[PDB]
Amino acid sequence: SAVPDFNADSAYAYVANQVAFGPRVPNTAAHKACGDYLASELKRFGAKVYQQEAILTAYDGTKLEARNIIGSFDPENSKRVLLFAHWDSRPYSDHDPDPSKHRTPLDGADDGGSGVGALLEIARQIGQKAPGIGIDIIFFDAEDYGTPEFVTDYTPDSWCLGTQFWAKNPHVPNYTAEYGILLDMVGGKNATFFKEQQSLRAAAPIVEMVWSAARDLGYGKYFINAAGGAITDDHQYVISGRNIPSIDIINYDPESKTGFASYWHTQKDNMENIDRETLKAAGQTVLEVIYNR
Numbered sequence: 247s248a249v250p251d252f253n254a255d256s257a258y259a260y261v262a263n264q265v266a267f268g269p270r271v272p273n274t275a276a277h278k279a280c281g282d283y284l285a286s287e288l289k290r291f292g293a294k295v296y297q298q299e300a301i302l303t304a305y306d307g308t309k310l311e312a313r314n315i316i317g318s319f320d321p322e323n324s325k326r327v328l329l330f331a332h333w334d335s336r337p338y339s340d341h342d343p344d345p346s347k348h349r350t351p352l353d354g355a356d357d358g359g360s361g362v363g364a365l366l367e368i369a370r371q372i373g374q375k376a377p378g379i380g381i382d383i384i385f386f387d388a389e390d391y392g393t394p395e396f397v398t399d400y401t402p403d404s405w406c407l408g409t410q411f412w413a414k415n416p417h418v419p420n421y422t423a424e425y426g427i428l429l430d431m432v433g434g435k436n437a438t439f440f441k442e443q444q445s446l447r448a449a450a451p452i453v454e455m456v457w458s459a460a461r462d463l464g465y466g467k468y469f470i471n472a473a474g475g476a477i478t479d480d481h482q483y484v485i486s487g488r489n490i491p492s493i494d495i496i497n498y499d500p501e502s503k504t505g506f507a508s509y510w511h512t513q514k515d516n517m518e519n520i521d522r523e524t525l526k527a528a529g530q531t532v533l534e535v536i537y538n539r
């Protein structure tokens with residue numbers, strides 16, 4: 247139609263390809279190899295790719311060799327939409343039931359892999375058929391290296407470090423877009439995306455447009471027509487730092503102890519939860535919106 251077909255098999259394979267490297271922990275070989283892969287994949291689609299490298303400081307003082315990866319399509323268009331996700335994997339499994347796993351990196355299949363894999367498939371479609379507005383795909387680094395449950399000292403703003411850096415130092419001067427859409431944990435079987443509070447406060451028309459498109463397409467069992475909780479995530483820093491109204495599409499459970507999927511920040515954030523039908527619902531909705539709303 248006006249709108250390309252999101253190939254969920256393809257998105258799933260992009261998730262699997264990330265996970266295959268090993269956990270994408272900043273400073274590791276797996277992180278460097280996966281980042282190189284992500285950059286090359288955006289370039290093959292025809293994006294103008296920027297690799298923003300910066301040394302960021304984690305809550306414990308670790309210097310992180312961070313790399314935000316930006317792919318820009320129709321780069322001279324002043325009218326743009328930002329689509330983003332984090333690509334790092336957490337170095338801890340600090341919600342794992344087994345204390346011997348708390349200090350072990352997780353695969354981050356849903357928490358990292360899913361949003362990036364959905365965006366890779368979206369970007370693949372954009373490369374084949376221009377939507378008529380500029381699109382920037384951003385994979386933000388060092389999102390999930392915040393203070394773990396077993397550390398008692400507090401550090402403000404310890405999450406979303408790559409986004410914090412970019413928002414202050416964008417890849418092009420005074421970068422702006424009409425709106426932003428973050429995908430985070432968009433791969434889990436039977437995921438439920440509620441209207442997140444920061445998204446509504448900053449960008450209710452964007453929320454409404456996306457949730458209505460999802461309903462039009464038949465994905466209302468995923469895009470729940472209800473208010474969710476407030477979630478700390480990369481979009482808050484895009485809102486505060488670049489003044490781009492942005493939303494978060496994220497699996498939320500209003501009755502979970504953490505608000506997240508059962509496997510969040512555990513060793514079970516692995517490929518077994520990833521589901522083509524969930525990826526399809528998220529990805530096709532985003533295509534509908536950027537091409538056709």
Ligand SMILES: [Zn+2]
Pocket residue numbers: 336357390511
């Ligand atoms: Zn996480």
